[PDB]
Design an enzyme around this catalytic site. Structure first.
Site, PDB file in Angstrom:
ATOM      1  N   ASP A 180       0.864  -1.173   0.000  1.00 61.23           N
ATOM      2  CA  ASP A 180       0.000   0.000   0.000  1.00 61.23           C
ATOM      3  C   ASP A 180       0.909   1.234   0.000  1.00 61.23           C
ATOM      4  O   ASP A 180       1.889   1.294   0.751  1.00 61.23           O
ATOM      5  CB  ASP A 180      -0.904  -0.016   1.242  1.00 61.23           C
ATOM      6  CG  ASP A 180      -0.121  -0.191   2.538  1.00 61.23           C
ATOM      7  OD1 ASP A 180       0.131   0.824   3.227  1.00 61.23           O
ATOM      8  OD2 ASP A 180       0.253  -1.340   2.856  1.00 61.23           O
ATOM      9  N   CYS A 214      -7.897  -1.734  -5.493  1.00 60.71           N
ATOM     10  CA  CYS A 214      -6.879  -2.006  -4.492  1.00 60.71           C
ATOM     11  C   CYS A 214      -7.716  -1.808  -3.236  1.00 60.71           C
ATOM     12  O   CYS A 214      -8.828  -2.332  -3.168  1.00 60.71           O
ATOM     13  CB  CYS A 214      -5.684  -1.036  -4.571  1.00 60.71           C
ATOM     14  SG  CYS A 214      -6.001   0.700  -5.013  1.00 60.71           S
ATOM     15  N   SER A 215      -7.229  -1.077  -2.245  1.00 65.32           N
ATOM     16  CA  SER A 215      -8.058  -0.883  -1.063  1.00 65.32           C
ATOM     17  C   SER A 215      -8.977   0.322  -1.298  1.00 65.32           C
ATOM     18  O   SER A 215     -10.191   0.228  -1.127  1.00 65.32           O
ATOM     19  CB  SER A 215      -7.198  -0.655   0.179  1.00 65.32           C
ATOM     20  OG  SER A 215      -8.015  -0.660   1.337  1.00 65.32           O
ATOM     21  N   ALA A 216      -8.390   1.444  -1.711  1.00 68.17           N
ATOM     22  CA  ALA A 216      -9.162   2.662  -1.972  1.00 68.17           C
ATOM     23  C   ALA A 216      -9.530   2.819  -3.449  1.00 68.17           C
ATOM     24  O   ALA A 216     -10.438   3.577  -3.795  1.00 68.17           O
ATOM     25  CB  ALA A 216      -8.385   3.878  -1.506  1.00 68.17           C
ATOM     26  N   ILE A 218      -7.413   3.965  -5.971  1.00 68.09           N
ATOM     27  CA  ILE A 218      -6.835   5.149  -6.610  1.00 68.09           C
ATOM     28  C   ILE A 218      -5.305   5.154  -6.687  1.00 68.09           C
ATOM     29  O   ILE A 218      -4.740   5.558  -7.700  1.00 68.09           O
ATOM     30  CB  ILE A 218      -7.314   6.474  -5.935  1.00 68.09           C
ATOM     31  CG1 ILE A 218      -6.887   6.523  -4.471  1.00 68.09           C
ATOM     32  CG2 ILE A 218      -8.835   6.587  -6.027  1.00 68.09           C
ATOM     33  CD1 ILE A 218      -7.259   7.827  -3.784  1.00 68.09           C
ATOM     34  N   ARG A 220      -2.617   2.387  -6.075  1.00 71.51           N
ATOM     35  CA  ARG A 220      -2.116   1.268  -6.857  1.00 71.51           C
ATOM     36  C   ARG A 220      -2.938   1.092  -8.141  1.00 71.51           C
ATOM     37  O   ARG A 220      -2.375   0.885  -9.210  1.00 71.51           O
ATOM     38  CB  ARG A 220      -2.139  -0.009  -6.010  1.00 71.51           C
ATOM     39  CG  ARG A 220      -1.026  -0.047  -4.969  1.00 71.51           C
ATOM     40  CD  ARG A 220      -1.164  -1.229  -4.020  1.00 71.51           C
ATOM     41  NE  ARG A 220      -2.181  -1.002  -2.993  1.00 71.51           N
ATOM     42  CZ  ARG A 220      -2.468  -1.867  -2.024  1.00 71.51           C
ATOM     43  NH1 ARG A 220      -1.816  -3.022  -1.950  1.00 71.51           N
ATOM     44  NH2 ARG A 220      -3.398  -1.575  -1.122  1.00 71.51           N
ATOM     45  N   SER A 221      -4.263   1.187  -8.034  1.00 68.58           N
ATOM     46  CA  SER A 221      -5.138   1.057  -9.201  1.00 68.58           C
ATOM     47  C   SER A 221      -4.823   2.144 -10.240  1.00 68.58           C
ATOM     48  O   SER A 221      -4.789   1.878 -11.445  1.00 68.58           O
ATOM     49  CB  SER A 221      -6.607   1.175  -8.780  1.00 68.58           C
ATOM     50  OG  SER A 221      -6.985   0.116  -7.917  1.00 68.58           O
ATOM     51  N   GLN A 261      -1.076   7.765  -5.741  1.00 68.89           N
ATOM     52  CA  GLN A 261      -0.932   8.361  -4.420  1.00 68.89           C
ATOM     53  C   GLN A 261       0.414   8.870  -3.919  1.00 68.89           C
ATOM     54  O   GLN A 261       0.454   9.610  -2.939  1.00 68.89           O
ATOM     55  CB  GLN A 261      -1.518   7.393  -3.395  1.00 68.89           C
ATOM     56  CG  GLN A 261      -3.025   7.445  -3.347  1.00 68.89           C
ATOM     57  CD  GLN A 261      -3.511   8.721  -2.700  1.00 68.89           C
ATOM     58  OE1 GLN A 261      -3.269   8.949  -1.516  1.00 68.89           O
ATOM     59  NE2 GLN A 261      -4.185   9.568  -3.471  1.00 68.89           N
TER      60      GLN A 261
END
Ligand SMILES: O=C(O)COc1c(Br)csc1C(=O)O
Length: 297
Positions: A180, A214-216, A218, A220-221, A261
Site C-alpha cells: 500500500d 486495491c483498497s481505496a 486510486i 495502486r489502481s 498516491q
C-alpha cells in the site's frame, strides 16, 4: 519525451515537486451522492469518493450507489472501472456491478489484510466446494480453478445471475506483492502481470470495462491504469514520443480523484511505460525477459 524528462527529474531529484504539481492541477468535481448519509456505510474511506459525473450506477431503484468510477479514456479508446475494495456489505453490489457492466476481468492489486488491517472483504470463494451466494443481488459465484504464481494468482470464476440463470466466466488477476502506498518489485514483475491481464482478452473492447481495485481504488489502481493507457496510446500511434504521461494522468483524474498516491508511484509509472515501450515497438523478446526477472515460478 518521457525518457528524457525522467532522467531530468531524477537528476534534480524533483519527483515530489512534479507529483505535487499534478495534484494542484487535478480536477475537482462534486461527490454529492457518495456523501449522502444513506451511503456512509458504502464507503471504505471518508476521503475517497467517486465524482457524481463518472460514478457507476447500480441498476436498482432502491440505492444505486457504489464507490466506483468509470475512467473513459476517449483518445486511447479504452475504459476501466476503478473501485474500492468491497466491504462486508457491498460484495453483492460489487458483483452486481461486474454483471451489469459486462466486465470480463477483475484486477486486484492488494491483499485482504495489509499492515494488520482488513483492506478488503473476502469477496470471492477460496475453495471450489464453497461457492458464494449474494442474496441481496441474487448472484452466485463459484471458484472454477486457480493458477498460483509467486507474487500473483489468476483465478477463473463463474458468475451466475440467479434471476435469469445466465452464466459468465470472470477472470480474477490478483497481484499479492504490491505494498500500500508502495511500488511493484520491479518494472519487470509489473509488466509481466499487466501482460497477463492483456493476454487474457479481458481488456478487449468487445467486453465491458475491466474492473480494477486495491483498497481505496486510486493509488495502486491508478498506477496500473496509467501505465496501461500510456502503452496503449503509444501502441496505436507506434510512437513512444507522442505520449505525455503527466497529461494522461490528469485526464484520468477527471474521472476519479487521487489517481496515483505517491511521487514514487508516479516515478514507477514512467519506468514501467519506458520499459513496456520496448515490446510495443517490436522487441517481442523482452516479454520472456520480464517473465524470468519476475520469478513467478
Ligand atoms: O493504493 C494505494 O497505494 C493506497 O491506497 C490507500 C488510500 Br488512497 C488510503 S488508505 C490506502 C491503503 O492502501 O490502505
Amino acid at each position: 519525451e518521457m525518457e528524457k524528462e525522467f532522467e531530468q527529474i531524477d537528476k534534480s531529484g524533483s519527483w515530489a515537486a512534479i507529483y505535487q504539481d499534478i495534484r494542484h492541477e487535478a480536477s475537482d468535481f462534486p461527490c454529492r451522492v457518495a456523501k449522502l448519509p444513506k451511503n456512509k456505510n458504502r464507503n471504505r474511506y471518508r476521503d475517497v469518493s467517486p465524482f457524481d459525473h463518472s460514478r457507476i450506477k447500480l441498476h436498482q431503484e432502491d440505492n444505486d450507489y457504489i464507490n466506483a468510477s468509470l475512467i473513459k479514456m476517449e483518445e486511447a479508446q479504452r475504459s476501466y472501472i476503478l473501485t474500492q475494495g468491497p466491504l462486508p456489505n457491498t460484495c453483492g453490489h460489487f458483483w452486481e456491478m461486474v454483471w451489469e457492466q459486462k466486465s470480463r476481468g477483475v484486477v486486484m492489486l492488494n491483499r485482504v489484510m495489509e499492515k494488520g488491517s482488513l483492506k478488503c472483504a473476502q469477496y470471492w470463494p477460496q475453495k471450489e466446494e464453497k461457492e458464494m451466494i449474494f442474496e441481496d443481488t441474487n448472484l452466485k459465484l463459484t471458484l472454477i480453478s486457480e493458477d498460483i504464481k509467486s507474487y500473483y494468482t489468476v483465478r477463473q470464476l463463474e458468475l451466475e445471475n440467479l434471476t435469469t440463470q445466465e452464466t459468465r466466466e470472470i477472470l480474477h488477476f490478483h497481484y499479492t506483492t504490491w505494498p500500500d502506498f508502495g511500488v511493484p518489485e520491479s518494472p519487470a514483475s509489473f509488466l509481466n502481470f499487466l501482460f497477463k491481464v492483456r493476454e487474457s482478452g479481458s481488456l478487449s473492447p468487445e467486453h465491458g470495462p475491466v474492473v480494477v481495485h486495491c483498497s481505496a481504488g486510486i493509488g495502486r489502481s491508478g498506477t496500473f491504469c496509467l501505465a496501461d493507457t500510456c502503452l496503449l496510446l503509444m501502441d496505436k500511434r507506434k510512437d513512444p514520443s507522442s505520449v505525455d504521461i503527466k497529461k494522461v494522468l490528469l485526464e484520468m483524474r477527471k474521472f476519479r480523484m487521487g489517481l496515483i498516491q505517491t511521487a514514487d508511484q508516479l516515478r514507477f509509472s514512467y519506468l514501467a511505460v519506458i520499459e513496456g515501450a520496448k515490446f510495443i515497438m517490436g522487441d517481442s523478446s523482452v516479454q520472456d525477459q520480464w517473465k524470468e526477472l519476475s520469478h513467478e515460478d
